[model samples]
Target chain A: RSLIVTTILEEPYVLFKKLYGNDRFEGYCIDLLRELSTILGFTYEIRLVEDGKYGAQDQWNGMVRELIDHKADLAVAPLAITYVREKVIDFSAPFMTLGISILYRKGTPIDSADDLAKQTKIEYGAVEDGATMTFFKKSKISTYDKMWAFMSSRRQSVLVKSNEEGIQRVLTSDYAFLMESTTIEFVTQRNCNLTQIGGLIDSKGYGVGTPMGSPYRDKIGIAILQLQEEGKLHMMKEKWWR
Target chain B: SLIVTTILEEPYVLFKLYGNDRFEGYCIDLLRELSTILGFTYEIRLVEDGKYGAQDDVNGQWNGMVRELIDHKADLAVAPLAITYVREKVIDFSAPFMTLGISILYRKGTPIDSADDLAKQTKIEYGAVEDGATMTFFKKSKISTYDKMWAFMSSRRQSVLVKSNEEGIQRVLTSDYAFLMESTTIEFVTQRNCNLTQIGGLIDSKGYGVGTPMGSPYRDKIGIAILQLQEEGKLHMMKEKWWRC
Candidate 1:
């Protein structure tokens, strides 16, 4: 039996490659899946989550829902290892390390979330209901809490639906997008007009997600550790990004 | 019985010469906590090499506690051994109990601010523990500053590289040497030795994880226990008790 792996369409993590009459999944996550399958001796079928959302507090959807519902045995994507999500789904050690950062125009006056939090002349927000937003919502750090106060106060006007939309808002308006550092790096490289404003606000990693009590959790972790040690994960990142 | 291999490092592992107490330190307590959490009993054994562990380029053989785990002489390595990529190939590590970074261990009053300052000048000499992660970082770094520093260290490898953290610290005290070492060790050193201070921000970030033999059943359970400890703030409380000046 093939393990159904749930993923989302995020650039460089998971993407679609067009063929003459068919499309195939490609990118870092796809490469990772291949490696895991090779090591674990399991066949897998990759399916994109029906809903576009990454799981949020009090709301279960996307790849996370797929795992909880047992629709998928594994969820491999740019899913972050966060405390809230840990209760419902088990995660392997972080395969990729990253943190929240600011994405804005290259020549923006702001250099940090602090800079954005201190002023209203420059508006700032994250992808609505995303990890970055969740962080601000849950943060106790004074700076982040202040920033959250600002964001949550005007959630309707400030919040955007997606990274693409946030990036667009940053480009066309006086908006700074809060996002994951990895995605920010990828976006800033491809679009010179955009740049990451500051260093990471926190430290964390993207992990492989499995439903609670899944036997595959630890096995997947071991495989990830092996891949990391072999430098295959680094190679995959380089391959997809290049 | 589970044989736990550890190293002798201040605040991590220390000898107890008094009656009935054999060894005690942060790692000892950590091992104790882990045992209770995982319901296992263990005996602590010191690494024969008196090293954390590093591979010799000449023979491709690993030495120290890492080797102990590799050779199955130890079931777990519960010390301040860094969780590095190379070591991960041979052993399984729990999620880090402590996170640290590489930084400069130097006497206060030097004009040196960063690795760049050391790489830029020839008057001041700098090096790391021989075969340690700091040394490996320089050896493998492609960045211009670190690459240049590596060249300097390579040329003076015999003279510059020290055998251990204590040796490096001794060199820093006696000569115009800056020791490139882990931040946690630097913090511990600076706390007791008021003359010493960390020179710059971390050059690189990494963590210290409990080591287990590859494919060990204990790895994942230990990882879960560590996270539980972290969530419960037990890790912080233990650090405060052991690493306090």
Candidate 2:
């Protein structure tokens, strides 16, 4: 059976077909996936999705009604590896580990994680409908009464559509801060005036997600492990980062 | 023949001691009282306290106001000057006419309400007048945990660091920077504009006095003049005129 893979347009990871042109998916991860398919001797079809709106309830309903009901083999993206999502589908070993990091303007007083806890006026956000925001809400660091109180007191907690939008918010708004990934190298490298002040407060990873009990799971997992063992994983990281 | 060299304390000595320049304050009134009581022909020369006083005692350069007294080019030195350990080695001083303290001047929107609040958070950036005594105090202060307070201030932090009271006050008026300055200077600034206000209480007290050369004949005369002015309540009145507002 031909495999079907779904992805989103997060630069340096996955670029959309519309922007880069149809019949082509280009990025560090896309290249890695293509090489894996070639090595495993399986042919796959790639589908583009809309930004962070993926994996939403409406999107999941549409996926069941359209992709699954139509008999697509699998779905793959930087789909957040979560137990909640695991109820509907299975995920391969994590290909990328990322967590929320605070980004602020260059000259802001924020220097470390401890500084974020002390400051009251600054607000933090994630991409709208992203798993990072869901994890942030449930995390121990943000679940405290004081934290909730402070969060509510803020004039507004920004929710953007992409990492690029989140970075832009921090760059232009002196009073604003953002929570994104350490893996977002593309965004951080271009914005010299923005700095990552702290490390990962929410520990979650991304993986290749597939429908539960699918026979493709064993084949895909073995192929990914082979890539990991041959150091292709590290090579892919260097390609995007450098 | 007492040559009373009076330094110009802005808004204090510019008019009375130097006879109509651009300054007037309590120190001018005190100089006027000293001239009246001494009843001696004296020359009032204007000089800066730091360089003039240091050069006179260390090198005996009588070209400046302080050097005149040390080289016997002048008989007395009177102005609003502080008696530090170095100054005391070269000159004598009368009882303090007024006491000043290091104080904070914050913009109206600053979040720092007290010293404790300042210590708890690292959000607000603080600055001091670059070369003033208050900056010196902040640099030498054992309380600050941040390394090299002066260097931290010099680094860009969306805050302005200034070298003078005027610069500091102007920054507070126009920007979000907070300044550590002398209480008297901050009061003077706040009186002119409502956007600035003194924060918390004084950091520490400093005394301002009339300084004369040690072992000079005019020392006794200047001391008596200061005491008599204090006794007659004229000194208090002068202080009230400039500082109380």
Candidate 3:
């Protein structure tokens, strides 16, 4: 049986592309899926998740929801490895590592999250309902708590719908976008007009999510480790990212 | 009671006795926290082979703590054991309690700024522990610089590869050498001995996780517990307490 793999459309992770008049999805996650399919000896079909959210408490939406409903055999995306998601689905060993970070226009006075929290002239926010947003919302650190409260106070204006929207706001307005460090690197490299503000807020990895008790979970994990060990993961990242 | 297999590594697991407490270190505290969270009683025992863990290529058999886990002699292998590609094949690891990477450790004022510099020259000999993750990294790496470095080390395996990290550290102190070691150990060593410092940024990224037998049901729960500790700041606090030096 061909597996239905669910994913979200994210920059450099999963994207729609046309190859010589053939329409298909391509990006980091697509490449990862190709590698995994060969190793696991299973055919697969890719489809975008119905609900676009990465997932959150009390709301099992997006690719995570597909996994829970058994609508998808696997979720191969830049979906974060979080405590809540782990309860609902199984995650392969992380194929990529990342952390929350800030993206801002170059030559900004704001150097870090602390700088963003200290002043009010330059407004900051994250992609609404994303892992980065969730991190600040759930963090207990004093600075993060204050930042979360500030974001909550002006949630309407500050919170953006997607990373692209947040990135646009950074370019057009005095806004700093909090996002994943991996995406920040990709954006900064492509658009020299922007830069990453500081080091990662916290470390985590992007894992392939599977349905609970899925046999493919461990098999996928071993394949990921193999790719990592062989330097295939790094090479593949460079292929899409560069 | 669960039998936990561990090794004596500074700040991770250490040998000391005081009353009923037979051991102490970062890992001991972590194990204690894990036991509390999971509600299991455990007995800690040092691995008989005294190796961190590694594979014997000839027979394709594992040794040290890894062997203990494979043989079902221990319920957990909670030490500074790294999560690597080879090890993950036969064992289950909880999400890493600590994330770190391989880095160069050398004396201060050295011209070496990266692994490339060491690989480019022959004056400053560099190596990692034999049959260890760091050695395995260089051995398995296909990257030009690391592969070349591995060739050099393999050629002089008898002199270059040490049996343990402590021996590697001694070589770095006594001769013209650079030790490729884990960043956390480098952090600890550089803190106490100002004469030594990490020469470059991390060569690769990896982590140290609690180990269990393959397909163990406890892996998921232990991972959840680790995440809880990470979020609650207990993991960092524990590292600070043990790594103060």
Candidates 1 and 3: which is better by TM-score? 3
Expressed as tens digits, the lDDT of each residue in B1-245 for candidate 3 is: 88899988998887765522978899999999989988999888889999867888789889988888888889899999999878988888888889888999999896899999999999889999998999999998888999999999999899989988889999999999999999999999888876888988988877899899987888898888887777667898998999882
Native contacts kept, each candidate: 0.05, 0.00, 0.42
TM-score of each: 0.67, 0.45, 0.93
Score candidate 1 by DockQ.
0.12
Better of 2 and 3 by TM-score: 3
User: Local error of candidate 3 at A20, Å?
Assistant: 11
What's the C-alpha lDDT at position B103 in model 3? 95
When 2 and 3 are scored with lDDT, the better candidate is 3
lDDT of 2 by residue, A14-92 (tens): 7744543325777876876787688778777777643334575444642322234444565555666554455456555
Name the runs in model 3 displaced over 4 angstroms.
Answer: A19-23, B16-20, B110-113, B120-123, B143-145
User: What lDDT score is found at residue A99 in candidate 3?
Assistant: 83
Name every residue pair that clashes in candidate 2.
B11-B24, B11-B25, B12-B24, B12-B25
Q: In model 3, what lDDT does residue A139 have?
A: 88
Candidate order (lDDT): 3, 1, 2
TM-score of chain B of each: 0.96, 0.73, 0.97
Q: In candidate 2, residue B64 scores what lDDT?
A: 42
Query: Which residue pairs collide in model 1, if any?
Result: none
